[PDB]
Design a protein around this ligand. Sequence first.
Ligand SMILES: Nc1ncnc2c1ncn2[C@@H]1O[C@H](COP(=O)(O)OP(=O)(O)OP(=O)(O)O)[C@@H](O)[C@H]1O
Ligand SMILES: Nc1ncnc2c1ncn2[C@@H]1O[C@H](COP(=O)(O)OP(=O)(O)OP(=O)(O)O)[C@@H](O)[C@H]1O
Ligand SMILES: Nc1ncnc2c1ncn2[C@@H]1O[C@H](COP(=O)(O)OP(=O)(O)O)[C@@H](O)[C@H]1O
Ligand SMILES: Nc1ncnc2c1ncn2[C@@H]1O[C@H](COP(=O)(O)OP(=O)(O)O)[C@@H](O)[C@H]1O
Ligand SMILES: [Mg+2]
Ligand SMILES: [Mg+2]
Ligand SMILES: [Mg+2]
Ligand SMILES: [Zn+2]
Lengths: 442, 229, 474, 322
Amino acid sequence: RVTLQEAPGTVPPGRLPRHREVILLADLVDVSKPGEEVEVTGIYKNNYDGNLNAKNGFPVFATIIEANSIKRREGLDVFSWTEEEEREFRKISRDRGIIDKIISSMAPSIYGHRDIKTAVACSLFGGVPKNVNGKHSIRGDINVLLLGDPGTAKSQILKYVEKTAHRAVFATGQGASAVGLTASVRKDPITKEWTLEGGALVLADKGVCLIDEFDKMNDQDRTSIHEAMEQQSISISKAGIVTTLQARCSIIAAANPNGGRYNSTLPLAQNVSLTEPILSRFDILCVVRDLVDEEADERLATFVVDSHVRSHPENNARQRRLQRQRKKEEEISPIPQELLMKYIHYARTKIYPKLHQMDMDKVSRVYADLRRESISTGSFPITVRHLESILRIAESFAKMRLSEFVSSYDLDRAIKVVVDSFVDAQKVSVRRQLRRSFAIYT
Amino acid sequence: EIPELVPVGEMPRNLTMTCDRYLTNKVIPGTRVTIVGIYSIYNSVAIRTPYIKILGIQSDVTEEEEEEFLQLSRNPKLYEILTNSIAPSIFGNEDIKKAIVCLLMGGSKKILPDGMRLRGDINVLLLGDPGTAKSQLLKFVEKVSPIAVYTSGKGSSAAGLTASVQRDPMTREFYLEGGAMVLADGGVVCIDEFDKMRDEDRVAIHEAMEQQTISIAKAGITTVLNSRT
Amino acid sequence: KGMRELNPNDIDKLINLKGLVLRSTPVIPDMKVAFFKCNVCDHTMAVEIDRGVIQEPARCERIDCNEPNSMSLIHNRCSFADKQVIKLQETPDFVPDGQTPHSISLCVYDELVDSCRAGDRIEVTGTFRSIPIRANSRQRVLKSLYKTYVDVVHVKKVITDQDLAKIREVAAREDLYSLLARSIAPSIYELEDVKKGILLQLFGGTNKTFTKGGRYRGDINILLCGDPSTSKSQILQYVHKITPRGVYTSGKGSSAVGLTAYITRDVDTKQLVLESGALVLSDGGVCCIDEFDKMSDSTRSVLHEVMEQQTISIAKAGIITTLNARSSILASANPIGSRYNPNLPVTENIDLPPPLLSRFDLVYLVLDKVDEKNDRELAKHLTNLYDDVLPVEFLTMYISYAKEHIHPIITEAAKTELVRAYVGMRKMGTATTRQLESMIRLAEAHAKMKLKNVVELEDVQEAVRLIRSAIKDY
Amino acid sequence: SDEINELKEMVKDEHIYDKLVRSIAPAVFGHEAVKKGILLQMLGGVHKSTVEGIKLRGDINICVVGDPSTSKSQFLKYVVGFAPRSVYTSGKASSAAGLTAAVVRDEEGGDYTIEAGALMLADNGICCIDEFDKMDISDQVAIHEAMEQQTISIAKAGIHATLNARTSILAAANPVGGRYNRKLSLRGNLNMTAPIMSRFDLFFVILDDCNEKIDTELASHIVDLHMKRDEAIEPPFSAEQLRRYIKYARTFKPILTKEARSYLVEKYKELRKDDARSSYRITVRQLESMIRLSEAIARANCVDEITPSFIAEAYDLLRQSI
DNA sequence: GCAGATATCACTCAGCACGA
DNA sequence: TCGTGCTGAGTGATATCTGCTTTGGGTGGGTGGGTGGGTTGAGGCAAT
Ligand SMILES: Nc1ncnc2c1ncn2[C@@H]1O[C@H](COP(=O)(O)OP(=O)(O)OP(=O)(O)O)[C@@H](O)[C@H]1O
Ligand SMILES: Nc1ncnc2c1ncn2[C@@H]1O[C@H](COP(=O)(O)OP(=O)(O)OP(=O)(O)O)[C@@H](O)[C@H]1O
Ligand SMILES: Nc1ncnc2c1ncn2[C@@H]1O[C@H](COP(=O)(O)OP(=O)(O)O)[C@@H](O)[C@H]1O
Ligand SMILES: Nc1ncnc2c1ncn2[C@@H]1O[C@H](COP(=O)(O)OP(=O)(O)O)[C@@H](O)[C@H]1O
Ligand SMILES: [Mg+2]
Ligand SMILES: [Mg+2]
Ligand SMILES: [Mg+2]
Ligand SMILES: [Zn+2]
């Protein structure tokens, strides 16, 4: 038995949703889980209930739907692909600069912030989790923290990746709590034994957990995410249901600096109220800066106005509509969005790139130089966590080409990404020296 | 159900089982078992509650192994090999490795007829900057030891550690339920993030390690539990 | 009789009680005459009820049709009466040694239903009845201990043409202003201007219903800030007695939520309800605050909306509604130092944000100067305790009649000089539109005192005279 | 047919814009800019969804800051008493919940459910806040997603959901101290930080400047209100006519002209240059703000294309705040 | 052992037809 | 013209019978007792 409730969007403005109880017989049990949108076709039956008559005071009959078929809510699923499509993906991957097209085709409606696009694409593609004889576990998820000035197209990118990602959960810092991020306990109406619900992090396992207005969350809730960030598991102890739950999901967080703006002079430590541990746990830290420049502002204004005019509601019949929609989509995206959505799923499912052989000394030298130049006061020490992130980003980049050999180009590009992310976070005074020293990598 | 077989986004399902006569007191919580029994239903619209009637238990848990262990002890570099096996994947920190080995083996118990029995167990403190593999060391210590509990200080609370006085719902009687230390009696408890743990829980842990017997005996009951850990 | 002196001897006898109402159940329908209809011949008959028992018939009363056990009760055609159950708590005085006061249940029927509200002192005459309690629902078995209650037969909650002819005589008196100002607070000595200002608050301005906009309310707010030993709290208590509604809230003894409204739940009905705070409970009265300075600015922010819109809007935890708080505010404050120093300006001596002081219609300043004659006369006046004044009973009727019937309307002569007065006030320089609205309200209020339907030049002149001489004419 | 005739007669007039501006908030005296802002807020702007799937806001937010004793709350009360859908809330009384989605246990139920709030009952409508400053910081950040994203996401006890609140919010605020300081900047006068200010479409500072003639006019008008009751108030258009005309305009969906696009780019460049190397008061939002204001102004005239004159007027409205 | 809802059996009464 | 013995019919009292709990919740208690059971989570408000 499941409880079906009306979709919040369908409900007229500020009215109570209406719910019924659906009975699933053999061959239909365990076909849906809480938090799904479904369509139920069945027989609407009624029966005499003494309790209802005693309570209401009139001869009213209980009603329930005896399910005959359940479906999820184009077709059945966009993420599903066919053998014919799998041949198209291999052809596309053969493109010499497919990675650049993937990055460009991501959030085309947003003009700038190419570093954001690179980082978020890497996070979406994900890494390859690794285990060593059951003694050492390495996370494969990639965490990205977005920080910058108020108007910079931050929340919109998270909203986009919510749609693009296979299994994604969107939560806001203000509207969240630890109980809703880990699990909630209910009482089973049949067995009368306490069961345990799934949380926001649990619902997004093997997916992405997007958090907006991250800095606004309370300390306890921000601690609730420490475990999922690194331990990749959430422990619960309520009502004698002690157990451990699986939570292996990547986290993309957006926040604005403390005080409302990023003082380029001061370091990232004082700018944001997050503690040093959580800041370290993040792989790529794409700091966003909103300065003033005539040419850049001209280009931005032109692009924004063109985007607004292009999306005006006024600007077979269904086939013609699809054709014009494709015209616009190709207008702003070198690759159609529909193909990219299936591409992400196929890459995350079938391809697990591995490092066969590559000149370690390159990344070792980069690590040594990072440590040499990071001793300066005001710069967080470059711990091995950066070296791990380099490898993770390299694996993700190789996943873009659907190639199981991590070539040199991908490793150098990952080095560039990590080095730029570290350099931008530091103060101006140290920024000058860091930019001077690092030339080959960037 | 085994964690591996749980489908993604779903939750582990439980099943009640019954054993009689010489099949009782054969397992303890946390042990992987293989069960051969009858899948029957007992009445508690027209539904029934499933359960299993056990007929055979085979848990994954002599002299030959004694000979092998004795030969191993005869190796002239036993200390070095044992210190090498401690966290093979973490570089450096040799002193911490040796200290963790000592903690794993522990110290001999001391008991005096008067009543003052000295402690024998060993505790260690790792206090360094982030990115140092302290958590990895703690995980390996948890896995290697025959009995171990890995607990995050902030994730749990005073109830999680030591013990907490609760009430039995079915019978409505105040009872005592042990914490991580109680469940870790005779083993090792790896506490992570000592800082974020609340001060009251820290003093509770202070007492627990001071006496190794969590003294919560009040509120309708006067029972005490041992926490040798 | 006392609630703690009712013995078994006094069962089934007429007694007299007094107490405080604690809670009353909703209306309960009590059957009086039953209605039966024969299922076969559709014949209808009505039968009476005796001692809570229906004298049901065994078979149809008709001769041709005599089918037994064929009669059925038509629930919606039987005559019904009104029943209600009240709980009475004995007065706090009767408590011998400070324990939980006892309570006695009461039953009222027909007219007396909905006659006493919760939290009222009443005197009830009724029969001290006794009734058994059934041990269980499904048996005739009865407990040996009987329940005691009172069957109420009477309840008493504890203008003539002659009075109107009498009231109209006072209004003709030339020195009416002085008479009322001297009778409002008989004891206070030589505070005629403060008394006059206080009196005009009781009468209030004129009410205006106004579509194409919002309602305009003639409520006056007065601030009494000055040196400590002067009679400030005494006047607060004196006015608190006169007004029909009001709450004596103090400083640091009230909360932001406590003043406006508190969200709670009703245990009996298990529904989300909201209580009335001090300001809401004073709707139509005059609120009183003692220590305004000794109040956190977080709570003071509540008063911003009360004095401006005469309403409070709450939106939290699923409750989104507005409660009317059409009440007058009378607050007092003390100087930062041990006394008031004339040298420094007003905004420094009294605390409070400068903008807040502008909201108040009148802001008085009473200081205890030292003199060889003022102190002598005051001492002779406060020591006699060990120039006639109207009795309070008649004064309350006077103010009630004036507040209900009279409704002044401004005249052209009033406007012609009100524009002049406001522009002159602004020219000498704090002075904002609120001062002009205060002048309008005060002119309307003073006209109410003399029972006139038109505001004259003299009344507005008196209003402006009062305003300049409150802050004080250095 | 008769109402249609009246509507077309309304449109035919070439002085419609100032007529509507004068009619709005008839009780208040001569505040043309604030009335224009309220009108443009009521009309609203076109909301669009790109080929992406990301939604561009189409509602307008206005905050009126002024010294106490000024005519701030009068505008809010008028809007509450005129708008089709709207609610009134106070800064101190309001809380994080009630102003947003709230989770309360179901009546006669053990299960939690979402209870609407102020920003939910005002869907596709105007919400009014009287004392923005007095609101706590915890509650202020509650309305951050509803202002721009136009959606409310809550992840509380087993209630994972994403509601929608497409509401326009209009608020009145007092200065940090008692009176507006001329020397200090807007951000200096208000305790509100950069994000909230950037979110707001317009800012209308009202100063109680002293002048003999306007003082006499205001005194005469306010006394006339109390003497003549309602007949002293003579809006050009009655309330019913105004609510019919507004309803007619909202159906139109203007579009941008090429020259208008270039002119808008130029004006955005001018604003960014004026702010000058960071921009505290001007963000990318302000371009969309000008677009929305121009579309609303075009709606006011009942036209389906935005000429450069509307863009210039919108720029004048925006520049005034700085 | 105790109260309440239910169904069983036995006894006595008003009508009927015939005979006095 | 009429008197009385036989019959069907219908209550009255009495025979067996089920039931003797029942129930989630603190204005039902704990001298009714746990083998009759009760295992939250958000939001508001005083203290500070
Ligand atoms: N580079 C850009 N290209 C296009 N539009 C942009 C760009 N930068 C900002 N914008 C616009 O700026 C507006 C800002 O709203 P958005 O939801 O993107 O985030 P935000 O509210 O400014 O973020 P924050 O949470 O940091 O306050 C959006 O309409 C977005 O379209
Ligand atoms: N010598 C080392 N060999 C391998 N990994 C190391 C070494 N030193 C540090 N690490 C790093 O330790 C990480 C896991 O431990 P972690 O850094 O979480 O411990 P921690 O410093 O206690 O963490 P935190 O202080 O952030 O809570 C690995 O990702 C890893 O590469
Ligand atoms: N003018 C006056 N008339 C009557 N009593 C006065 C006067 N001035 C002072 N008093 C006496 O002095 C005391 C002042 O106390 P109180 O009124 O409580 O001062 P406050 O309330 O301002 O602290 C009163 O009890 C009152 O009897
Ligand atoms: N221009 C005006 N027209 C009409 N009434 C006005 C005007 N200016 C001020 N007022 C009156 O002055 C009073 C004080 O304004 P108020 O609503 O307190 O402002 P705020 O919202 O800052 O508190 C209002 O109730 C209003 O009736
Ligand atoms: Mg945002
Ligand atoms: Mg760690
Ligand atoms: Mg006092
Ligand atoms: Zn009948």
